[PDB]
Design a protein around this ligand. Structure first.
Ligand code: HEM
Length: 289
């Protein structure tokens, strides 16, 4: 399968900056969501889940087709809770009906990262909605109750290496788990993008406990939690080295996350040689808005 990026007709940087701005303004406005976390984290998770269905072997899944809009994918047990992100984006899509679904979902993630003070993430337009029969089956997103070997193997399907995996997982500085969604009991949440996932891993006194859904998770007295797959990053010696690197270099983490997240959001897409360069959107703050 080949998915060729096709620019929404006549659109350019300014059009997409307007969409970015609408998302960013709504992120600022709707501040009460999820006990005042806001919609930032769920939008990042949405962008990842619509991308993380990709399979490098046959180019099925991925962000291109915007298939999360279809019931099979929308109702994936792995996507429980993301409906909130979709509902957030609905009025945005209504205001800008010309943007494709894949472009909107991925741009939501970029906007959220940047507005939460994370790194700039270059972003490319041109995802094109594909039909319902192109929706990937459930079961392509990762389990959280597994070890480092599982994580490593899983991410090979997305063409991610050890550094890319550890960098991407840094997004777990954001938001929280919700028992009703995933069977994991949320701890201290955050809506500012930093390298504190790695600092928490290395510095907290972690205890392996069972939550009210009878699943194991790692908890600290300070009120933080880690999934078994999160904690696996300090159990595996190769992942541990990289965790230490990012814990000690905020800029390096930002740069590596930016590259890995763009790659994740672009997997499966063929960009014509004369396609526009990636866009780097200004934050509301940078615009004085
Ligand atoms: C082994 C890989 C991963 C596993 C097993 C995993 C699992 C989970 C689980 C179980 C939750 C809780 C969902 C809920 O209860 O609402 C969660 C939340 C989240 N995940 Fe991951 N995740 C992984 C990788 C990633 C990646 C690569 C990203 C983005 C780069 C990401 C971004 C997020 C964000 C931002 C949240 C917070 C959502 C919210 O607060 O509503 N995760 N993850």
């Amino acid at each position: 399968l080949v998915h060729v990026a096709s620019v929404e007709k006549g659109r350019s940087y300014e059009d997409f900056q307007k969409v970015y701005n609408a998302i960013a303004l709504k992120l600022r406005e709707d501040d009460e969501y999820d006990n005042y976390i806001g919609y930032g984290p769920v939008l990042v998770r949405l962008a990842w889940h619509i991308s993380g269905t990709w399979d490098k072997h046959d180019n099925t899944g991925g962000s291109y087709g915007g298939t999360y809009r279809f019931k099979k994918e929308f109702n994936d047990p792995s996507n429980a809770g993301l409906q909130n992100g979709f509902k957030f984006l609905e009025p945005i899509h209504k205001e800008f009906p010309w943007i494709s679904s894949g472009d909107l979902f991925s741009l939501g993630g970029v906007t959220a990262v940047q507005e939460m003070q994370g790194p700039k993430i270059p972003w490319r337009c041109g995802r094109v909605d594909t039909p319902e029969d192109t929706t990937p089956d459930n079961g392509r997103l990762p389990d959280a109750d597994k070890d480092a070997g599982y994580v490593r193997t899983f991410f090979q399907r997305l063409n991610m290496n050890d550094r890319e995996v550890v960098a991407l997982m840094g997004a777990h500085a954001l938001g929280k788990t919700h028992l009703k969604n995933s069977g994991y009991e949320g701890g201290g949440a955050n809506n500012v993008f930093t390298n504190e996932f790695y600092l928490n891993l290395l510095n907290e006194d972690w205890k392996l406990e069972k939550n009210d859904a009878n699943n194991e998770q790692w908890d600290s007295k300070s009120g933080y939690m880690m999934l078994p797959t999160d904690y696996s990053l300090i159990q595996d010696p190769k992942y541990l080295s990289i965790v230490k690197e990012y814990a000690n270099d905020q800029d390096k983490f930002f740069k590596d996350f930016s590259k890995a997240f763009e790659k994740l959001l672009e997997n499966g897409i063929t960009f014509p040689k004369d396609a526009p360069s990636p866009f780097i959107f200004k934050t509301l703050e940078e615009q004085g808005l």
